[PDB]
């Protein structure tokens, strides 16, 4: 019993934060097999932020002005290209600490644990979801690019983001690991506003599900709703719409619980239209967005 | 910017994890140097955790009995011992992952991270504090005895918790390292209900701290308090008492924000006597407890 905001074990990706240093600027880096992967504004004058062309700024750079530290060793910079948004650099030695890994490009509503890193040291761990509106509600500082977000099946690490910046909302942009961003987001000082942040509906009806499975009931109503009334609903409360391929994913936790998805969905339409009454779900005041169905599951079964 | 309810690195106690079968009982233990150290309710037959008498039934085990798995190789038991409620298995070799350690009691209000395993394997990290009333808010299922809680400092991991059972409310108790538990609580299948949880008066002081320097200010008032006043406020809504030396404690977040302390108990003391009113603070609707001023300052400067 017990549902927290659980985060993937980090050691698996602690053993690949290394360093990246471009003149005076230092941000983390990626280090999987002879590649250190990193964002390209590691070049950035810190006054040419506002309109950087990458490709110039790069002919300025050669594999020797990457001082790539791995703990206290430097890394021997044998080659480096721009993909995108990120720097590859590759080294001369291969990360003896490689996990088995993926790079994955994530879907908004999909979740995933960042370790936050600074000089290339880990410092904390905590559970994000890609929102959407391609943003991410993260827990950066100044010095925090190149910190990963990741998911593990099993003793797979697939990455799925890395941190390129903050957008002056607080909120957090950056791309995969192929270096194309989430969303419209630039790699520049300009500016970007972020667009609506919609509730992710379907993660709230799981993780609605997850309370039922840990005792929390009082919210279960003698209602039921169709797709088309809890979505006129959805909408005005600036939820995503629920989609038939959300009931379907949702299927497990439904046979579980004995509770049809459409009747948590009138649950939830209770609770959008009346708020909590200063009830409680799990520990939370407000409707929890960042659990996906599978997390769910994940979490109450003890997926290792 | 941004705050997320960040826990330590996992990795250095990951290395750590070990399974551990007496009879049919599986469960978890922490292998630090040549012991393994894991609840002494390994050992109960599962038909006789209402009365059991552990001196007794320890008579009936022998090394050969623990079954210490580290990965998928098998540990040799050279020795084994009871200490308070937690067994030491000696084995015959020194875990080679084995990190810098202490073993620390820690008080209630204090937070640690919890890696949560299952057969020896880890399977999710979360942040945690000791309530109060002694039990932890955890996520924990069957088998996850033996799963530790820690803070790491730099590089030595501080183990202060491990998981030995779930109150019939939902909760947890567990003991220190040392195998003494955490408040009253017995590793017996007995009524054992849980005292008041009240609310770490500090850690919610700390988290508008932080909510201020992320810059959620709506709830900052034109008042002050003394702390007898404040601790009045605090008493009739079920948080604990304020001392001088949580303001001391206080006293960097209170410099750094230019908010005086009296006058964020002041702001809290509104916020208890007339509600967020629909508002949220750093993305919670209630007031939020389990960060402690160290962790605030932590995430906020970016201690690695
Ligand atoms: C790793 C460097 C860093 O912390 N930041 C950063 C990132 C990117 C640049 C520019 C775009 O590329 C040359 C500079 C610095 C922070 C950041 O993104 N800062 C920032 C905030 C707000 C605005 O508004 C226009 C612009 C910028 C660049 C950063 C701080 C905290 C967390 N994550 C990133
Ligand atoms: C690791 C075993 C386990 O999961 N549990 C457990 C722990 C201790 C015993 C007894 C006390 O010692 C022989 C048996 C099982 C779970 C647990 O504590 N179960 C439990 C729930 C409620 C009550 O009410 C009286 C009693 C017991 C024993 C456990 C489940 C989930 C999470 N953590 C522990």
Redesign the pocket.
Known sequence: SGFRKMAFPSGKVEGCMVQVTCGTTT?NGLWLDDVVYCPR?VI?TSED?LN?NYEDLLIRKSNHNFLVQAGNVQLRVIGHSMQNCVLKLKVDTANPKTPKYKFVRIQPGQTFSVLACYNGSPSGVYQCAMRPNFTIKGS??????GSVGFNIDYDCVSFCYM??????TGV?AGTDLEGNFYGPFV????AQAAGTDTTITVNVLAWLYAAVINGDRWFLNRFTTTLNDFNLVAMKYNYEPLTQDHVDILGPLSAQTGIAVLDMCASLKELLQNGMNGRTILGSALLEDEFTPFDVVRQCSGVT
């Open positions: 941000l504004h950035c932020m950087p950066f500082l100044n010095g925090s690019c941190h390129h910046m903050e957008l002056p957090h790699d520049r000082q300009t």
